[PDB]
Design an enzyme around this catalytic site. Structure first.
Site, PDB file in Angstrom:
ATOM      1  N   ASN A   1     108.693  78.929 137.814  1.00 44.25           N
ATOM      2  CA  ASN A   1     107.641  78.345 136.947  1.00 44.25           C
ATOM      3  C   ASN A   1     107.151  77.070 137.633  1.00 44.25           C
ATOM      4  O   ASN A   1     107.953  76.269 138.155  1.00 44.25           O
ATOM      5  CB  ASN A   1     108.185  78.003 135.565  1.00 44.25           C
ATOM      6  CG  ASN A   1     108.985  79.156 135.009  1.00 44.25           C
ATOM      7  OD1 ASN A   1     110.100  79.398 135.466  1.00 44.25           O
ATOM      8  ND2 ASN A   1     108.400  79.822 134.027  1.00 44.25           N
TER       9      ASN A   1
ATOM     10  N   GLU B   1     112.110  85.267 133.767  1.00 47.16           N
ATOM     11  CA  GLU B   1     112.498  84.579 132.528  1.00 47.16           C
ATOM     12  C   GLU B   1     112.645  85.678 131.444  1.00 47.16           C
ATOM     13  O   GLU B   1     111.824  86.574 131.292  1.00 47.16           O
ATOM     14  CB  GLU B   1     111.591  83.458 132.091  1.00 47.16           C
ATOM     15  CG  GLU B   1     110.358  83.797 131.319  1.00 47.16           C
ATOM     16  CD  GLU B   1     109.171  82.891 131.136  1.00 47.16           C
ATOM     17  OE1 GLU B   1     108.734  82.655 129.970  1.00 47.16           O
ATOM     18  OE2 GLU B   1     108.589  82.399 132.133  1.00 47.16           O
TER      19      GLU B   1
ATOM     20  N   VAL C   1      83.449  67.308 132.801  1.00 49.77           N
ATOM     21  CA  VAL C   1      82.669  67.064 133.999  1.00 49.77           C
ATOM     22  C   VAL C   1      82.009  68.372 134.436  1.00 49.77           C
ATOM     23  O   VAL C   1      82.692  69.392 134.519  1.00 49.77           O
ATOM     24  CB  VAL C   1      83.541  66.513 135.139  1.00 49.77           C
ATOM     25  CG1 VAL C   1      82.709  66.346 136.401  1.00 49.77           C
ATOM     26  CG2 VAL C   1      84.198  65.203 134.724  1.00 49.77           C
TER      27      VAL C   1
ATOM     28  N   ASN D   1     102.752  75.334 127.182  1.00 50.89           N
ATOM     29  CA  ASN D   1     103.698  76.062 128.035  1.00 50.89           C
ATOM     30  C   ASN D   1     105.079  76.103 127.431  1.00 50.89           C
ATOM     31  O   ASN D   1     105.393  75.520 126.387  1.00 50.89           O
ATOM     32  CB  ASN D   1     103.638  75.524 129.473  1.00 50.89           C
ATOM     33  CG  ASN D   1     104.224  74.181 129.725  1.00 50.89           C
ATOM     34  OD1 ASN D   1     105.144  73.712 129.045  1.00 50.89           O
ATOM     35  ND2 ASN D   1     103.720  73.536 130.810  1.00 50.89           N
TER      36      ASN D   1
ATOM     37  N   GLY E   1      98.107  72.119 130.261  1.00 46.61           N
ATOM     38  CA  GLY E   1      99.032  73.210 130.009  1.00 46.61           C
ATOM     39  C   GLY E   1     100.354  72.792 129.451  1.00 46.61           C
ATOM     40  O   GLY E   1     101.101  73.596 128.873  1.00 46.61           O
TER      41      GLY E   1
ATOM     42  N   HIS F   1     100.313  81.158 135.354  1.00 50.34           N
ATOM     43  CA  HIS F   1     100.603  80.229 136.459  1.00 50.34           C
ATOM     44  C   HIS F   1      99.573  80.373 137.577  1.00 50.34           C
ATOM     45  O   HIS F   1      99.857  80.862 138.668  1.00 50.34           O
ATOM     46  CB  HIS F   1     101.979  80.554 137.057  1.00 50.34           C
ATOM     47  CG  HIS F   1     103.112  80.603 136.127  1.00 50.34           C
ATOM     48  ND1 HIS F   1     104.275  81.247 136.515  1.00 50.34           N
ATOM     49  CD2 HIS F   1     103.305  80.133 134.845  1.00 50.34           C
ATOM     50  CE1 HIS F   1     105.089  81.179 135.493  1.00 50.34           C
ATOM     51  NE2 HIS F   1     104.542  80.502 134.459  1.00 50.34           N
TER      52      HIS F   1
HETATM   53  C1  LIG Z   1     101.404  80.363 128.002  1.00 46.59           C
HETATM   54  C2  LIG Z   1     101.819  79.548 129.216  1.00 46.59           C
HETATM   55  C3  LIG Z   1     103.138  79.363 129.498  1.00 46.59           C
HETATM   56  C4  LIG Z   1     103.569  78.601 130.586  1.00 46.59           C
HETATM   57  N1  LIG Z   1     104.937  78.335 130.717  1.00 46.59           N
HETATM   58  C5  LIG Z   1     105.319  77.497 131.787  1.00 46.59           C
HETATM   59  C6  LIG Z   1     106.621  76.979 131.816  1.00 46.59           C
HETATM   60  O1  LIG Z   1     107.476  77.147 130.937  1.00 46.59           O
HETATM   61  N2  LIG Z   1     106.925  76.253 132.957  1.00 46.59           N
HETATM   62  C7  LIG Z   1     106.023  76.063 133.998  1.00 46.59           C
HETATM   63  O2  LIG Z   1     106.476  75.465 135.024  1.00 46.59           O
HETATM   64  N3  LIG Z   1     104.745  76.392 133.865  1.00 46.59           N
HETATM   65  C8  LIG Z   1     104.407  77.076 132.775  1.00 46.59           C
HETATM   66  N4  LIG Z   1     103.073  77.351 132.608  1.00 46.59           N
HETATM   67  C9  LIG Z   1     102.135  76.940 133.661  1.00 46.59           C
HETATM   68  C10 LIG Z   1     101.818  75.431 133.613  1.00 46.59           C
HETATM   69  O3  LIG Z   1     101.487  75.068 132.267  1.00 46.59           O
HETATM   70  C11 LIG Z   1     100.671  75.154 134.580  1.00 46.59           C
HETATM   71  O4  LIG Z   1     101.120  75.587 135.867  1.00 46.59           O
HETATM   72  C12 LIG Z   1     100.317  73.656 134.636  1.00 46.59           C
HETATM   73  O5  LIG Z   1      99.946  73.214 133.332  1.00 46.59           O
HETATM   74  C13 LIG Z   1      99.184  73.438 135.616  1.00 46.59           C
HETATM   75  O6  LIG Z   1      98.961  72.013 135.737  1.00 46.59           O
HETATM   76  P1  LIG Z   1      97.599  71.477 136.341  1.00 46.59           P
HETATM   77  O7  LIG Z   1      97.720  70.012 136.424  1.00 46.59           O
HETATM   78  O8  LIG Z   1      97.223  72.254 137.559  1.00 46.59           O
HETATM   79  O9  LIG Z   1      96.488  71.876 135.248  1.00 46.59           O
HETATM   80  P2  LIG Z   1      96.442  72.037 133.651  1.00 46.59           P
HETATM   81  O10 LIG Z   1      97.762  71.689 133.049  1.00 46.59           O
HETATM   82  O11 LIG Z   1      95.875  73.391 133.371  1.00 46.59           O
HETATM   83  O12 LIG Z   1      95.443  70.890 133.187  1.00 46.59           O
HETATM   84  C14 LIG Z   1      94.035  70.866 133.504  1.00 46.59           C
HETATM   85  C15 LIG Z   1      93.390  70.010 132.451  1.00 46.59           C
HETATM   86  O13 LIG Z   1      92.018  69.750 132.910  1.00 46.59           O
HETATM   87  C16 LIG Z   1      91.102  69.954 131.830  1.00 46.59           C
HETATM   88  N5  LIG Z   1      89.828  70.281 132.398  1.00 46.59           N
HETATM   89  C17 LIG Z   1      89.513  71.395 133.099  1.00 46.59           C
HETATM   90  N6  LIG Z   1      88.301  71.373 133.598  1.00 46.59           N
HETATM   91  C18 LIG Z   1      87.790  70.136 133.207  1.00 46.59           C
HETATM   92  C19 LIG Z   1      86.534  69.530 133.413  1.00 46.59           C
HETATM   93  N7  LIG Z   1      85.565  70.100 134.154  1.00 46.59           N
HETATM   94  N8  LIG Z   1      86.335  68.321 132.841  1.00 46.59           N
HETATM   95  C20 LIG Z   1      87.303  67.809 132.112  1.00 46.59           C
HETATM   96  N9  LIG Z   1      88.532  68.265 131.833  1.00 46.59           N
HETATM   97  C21 LIG Z   1      88.702  69.469 132.444  1.00 46.59           C
HETATM   98  C22 LIG Z   1      91.760  71.030 130.988  1.00 46.59           C
HETATM   99  O14 LIG Z   1      91.197  71.136 129.680  1.00 46.59           O
HETATM  100  C23 LIG Z   1      93.251  70.662 131.052  1.00 46.59           C
HETATM  101  O15 LIG Z   1      93.639  69.790 130.005  1.00 46.59           O
HETATM  102  C24 LIG Z   1     102.620  78.044 131.445  1.00 46.59           C
HETATM  103  C25 LIG Z   1     101.302  78.156 131.126  1.00 46.59           C
HETATM  104  C26 LIG Z   1     100.866  78.930 130.001  1.00 46.59           C
HETATM  105  C27 LIG Z   1      99.384  79.035 129.720  1.00 46.59           C
END
Ligand SMILES: Cc1cc2nc3c(=O)[nH]c(=O)nc-3n(C[C@H](O)[C@H](O)[C@H](O)COP(=O)(O)OP(=O)(O)OC[C@H]3O[C@@H](n4c[nH+]c5c(N)ncnc54)[C@H](O)[C@@H]3O)c2cc1C
Length: 498
Positions: free
Chosen positions: A477, A353, A242, A111, A107, A439
């Site tokens: 966030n 925000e 996976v 993000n 993300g 989120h």
């Molecule tokens: C449009 C948008 C705006 C946002 N704006 C903000 C912001 O400004 N500030 C903020 O604090 N948060 C923001 N967020 C939320 C933040 O990006 C999110 O909470 C974190 O990225 C979550 O981190 P994780 O490590 O849980 O997880 P994440 O970042 O979603 O990463 C998971 C990774 O695992 C990969 N994956 C999933 N399943 C598998 C599998 N089975 N095998 C292999 N790879 C896999 C996937 O492709 C990804 O690259 C935003 C999110 C979006 C979508």
């Protein structure tokens, strides 16, 4: 083959974990289902902008979509596309659409960069089993530094056309007695000033964010993951998803891993085994892996809390129509800089925000993404027929979130004699978008499905690291909290277990 540690995913929890594992000398393989985003595309840029979406915008969809809030102005740029391993995945459940990044960095690629520490009293409420002093004294600072959080220059902010939209909502909120706050970010604000001066290539000031930023944004590939690779003990394999996890007869874990090309064609299915297994696949992905493993019998000793406790961080989007004398500007930085902090830990709490809009012409709209305190939670329930987790969340479960957001923005409308927009989310009159989530939080909650460091209950050397650990809500966030918690968790796990 075998590798000592495997990390699934490359988002915040994964990236922190892999860096510290590599620094501890543990050879670590990260498996990422999306791409390494480093190849110039047909426009010469890695990522598409919001005004020129193409297949790079979308994870296996057949048509581009407008950013939420902007359909009325950006549907004109939508086009049919080939399904492709693009960067932003709208994951549709029955009554909720969750948006997630797909690629090396998760993300962090898509993000808004907003890097916000939760209120300590709220942290203490949501995670009472966690020592809050170590978090605030050690782990939040560590996260802040490693993420490369920075702060906008206030004089520049006050002066620039690119933040007029933010100043307009600040003035309107102030008439209602409501205060704003600057929002720290991982987008380099010095770079952003130089963009506005015409000195460097634009990204935030060229309607880029949600399909990636070609410049300026310090996503995790630049920060934690570059450092992890720098240890000499970490490698990353991309387009590797996976599918299943089992405990091998001789100890450790074995994974079935599908390798695809960017068109989604299956190239190989591999078996990869390890001693230590860290899940960083996100709230959605980690939870799905574990509900599948429980209910198909490959990790039969997982507990009943796996799947439970999901919430959308109280996310609600809404918009106000400004008076004609309060235009928000045609030029709006894609990176928010200001929020309205009306979060006091009560049920009326809102942290919202002030969101830019990408139309590029004057619309008079102010857009807001509210974070609220709504106790409702959903559950991910394995469907063996389709081999998918299903999220059982119904739209009426967001009524408390809508109510809180509405009460706050009603105050602003009353003080200013303004009304909501009702047409930004679809044709039906709807001022509050209540069926999306940026989120996602929960599904493998810390201390419920796991111990207080993300060790999965029922298993040894099996860890969850990511947004699945958080109990549905952090009031801000979330990525700084995910990062800081992951710093705490991996340090303890390495000391006690590795
Ligand atoms: C449009 C948008 C705006 C946002 N704006 C903000 C912001 O400004 N500030 C903020 O604090 N948060 C923001 N967020 C939320 C933040 O990006 C999110 O909470 C974190 O990225 C979550 O981190 P994780 O490590 O849980 O997880 P994440 O970042 O979603 O990463 C998971 C990774 O695992 C990969 N994956 C999933 N399943 C598998 C599998 N089975 N095998 C292999 N790879 C896999 C996937 O492709 C990804 O690259 C935003 C999110 C979006 C979508």
């Amino acid at each position: 083959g075998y590798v000592p540690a495997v990390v699934i995913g490359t988002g915040y929890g994964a990236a922190v974990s892999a860096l510290r594992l590599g620094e501890a000398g543990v050879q670590t393989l990260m498996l990422e289902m999306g791409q390494l985003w480093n190849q110039p595309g047909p426009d010469g840029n890695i990522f598409c902008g919001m005004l020129n979406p193409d297949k790079r915008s979308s994870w296996f969809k057949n048509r581009t979509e407008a950013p939420l809030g902007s359909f009325l102005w950006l549907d004109v740029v939508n086009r049919n596309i080939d399904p492709y391993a693009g960067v932003l995945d709208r994951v549709n459940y029955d009554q909720m659409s969750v948006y997630v990044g797909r690629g090396v960095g998760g993300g962090s690629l898509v993000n808004g960069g907003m890097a916000v520490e939760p209120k300590r009293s709220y942290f203490e409420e949501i995670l009472p089993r966690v020592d809050s002093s170590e978090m605030y004294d050690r782990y939040f600072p560590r996260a802040n530094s490693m993420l490369r959080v920075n702060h906008i220059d206030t004089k520049w902010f006050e002066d620039t056309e690119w933040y007029k939209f933010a100043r307009v909502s600040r003035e309107q909120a102030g008439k209602a007695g409501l205060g704003t706050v600057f929002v720290p970010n991982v987008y380099d604000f010095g770079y952003m000033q130089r963009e506005a001066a015409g000195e460097v290539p634009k990204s935030a000031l060229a309607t880029e964010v949600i399909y990636g930023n070609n410049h300026g944004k310090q996503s995790l590939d630049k920060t934690y993951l570059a450092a992890a690779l720098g240890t000499g003990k970490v490698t990353i394999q991309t387009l590797h998803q996976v599918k299943t996890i089992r405990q091998t007869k001789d100890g450790g874990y074995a994974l079935t891993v599908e390798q695809k090309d960017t068109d989604g064609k299956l190239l190989a299915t591999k078996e990869i085994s390890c001693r230590y297994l860290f899940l960083g696949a996100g709230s959605l992905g980690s939870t799905e892996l574990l509900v599948r493993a429980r209910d198909t019998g490959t990790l039969p000793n997982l507990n009943s809390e796996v799947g439970a406790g999901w919430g959308p961080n109280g996310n609600i989007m809404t918009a106000r129509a400004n008076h004609m004398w309060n235009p928000t500007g045609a030029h709006q930085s894609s990176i928010p800089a200001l929020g309205i902090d009306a979060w006091d830990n009560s049920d009326s709490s809102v942290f919202a925000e002030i969101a830019p809009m990408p139309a590029g012409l004057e619309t008079w709209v102010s857009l807001y993404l509210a974070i609220t305190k709504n106790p409702q939670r959903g559950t991910f329930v394995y469907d063996a027929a389709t081999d998918r987790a299903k999220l059982n969340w119904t739209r009426d479960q967001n009524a408390p979130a809508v109510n809180a957001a509405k009460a706050l923005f009603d105050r602003i409308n009353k003080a200013n004699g303004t009304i909501y927009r009702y047409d930004l989310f679809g044709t039906q009159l709807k001022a509050f978008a209540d069926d999306f989530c940026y989120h996602p939080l929960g599904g493998c909650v810390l201390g419920k499905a796991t111990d207080d460091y993300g060790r999965v209950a029922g298993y040894k050397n099996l860890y969850v690291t990511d947004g699945s650990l958080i109990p549905g809500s952090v009031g801000v966030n979330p990525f700084v909290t995910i990062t800081a918690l992951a710093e705490r968790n991996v340090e303890r796990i390495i000391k006690q277990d590795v």
